[PDB]
Design a protein around this ligand. Sequence first.
Ligand SMILES: NS(=O)(=O)c1ccc(S(=O)(=O)c2ccccc2)s1
Ligand SMILES: [Zn+2]
Length: 257
Amino acid sequence: HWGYGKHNGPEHWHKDFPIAKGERQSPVDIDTHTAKYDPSLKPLSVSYDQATSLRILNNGHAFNVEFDDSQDKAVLKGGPLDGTYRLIQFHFHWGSLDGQGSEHTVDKKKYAAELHLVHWNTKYGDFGKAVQQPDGLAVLGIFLKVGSAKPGLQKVVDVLDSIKTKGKSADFTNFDPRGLLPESLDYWTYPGSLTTPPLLECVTWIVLKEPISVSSEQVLKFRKLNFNGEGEPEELMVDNWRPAQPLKNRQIKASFK
Ligand SMILES: NS(=O)(=O)c1ccc(S(=O)(=O)c2ccccc2)s1
Ligand SMILES: [Zn+2]
């Protein structure tokens, strides 16, 4: 029943997923002044050389680029993590206008969009088991601002017209996610949740300080996707973000400065 509108949007989710009002929900505002620099945090290790993408899917909430995670390829480790987490998919959240779209905010600043690279902890054997553990996932979040084009994003933007409506899929091989990363891997980190139903409190969040630039034409093409399936009234896929949730007892740590 869940989505992003007036009647089924974030404000409604708690009725099917009571965890929505939990103790470690995401996203949050990142208060850059009360985030603690932690000199014991390691550099983040992002090893995407051997990433193998499989498909791209419109699931009626976002589009997901999925990876073959059957071998030890495309791993995130280091930083705040105690193990090897394996890339399984990425997706974005974005707005109807360039002034909103990100789920995390930085001193209340909303970026145009946010990229989520989702990884699961290899100690749990697969993604489906990992999501039922408190340290099962690590999600790398990267903000998008509108400015220069991101060349490495263009393959994704070009396939969107083939997956316009909810339930459509496309073969999407050999996409290199290193093309979506900014220069610096300086990050903030905190314990939280999936930002969509089922809202499971299983994520270590690593949010990069440095946004990537994408062009207005690139983000306009995200906005041409649809929430609805083929043959229903057209509902543009925009404003698929959850707003900041209460930090509650939590500390956000910074890897820098
Ligand atoms: N926006 S986010 O990165 O926090 C996110 C929401 C849902 C996912 S999941 O599709 O991997 C998933 C995980 C468990 C159950 C169902 C879907 S990841
Ligand atoms: Zn997400």
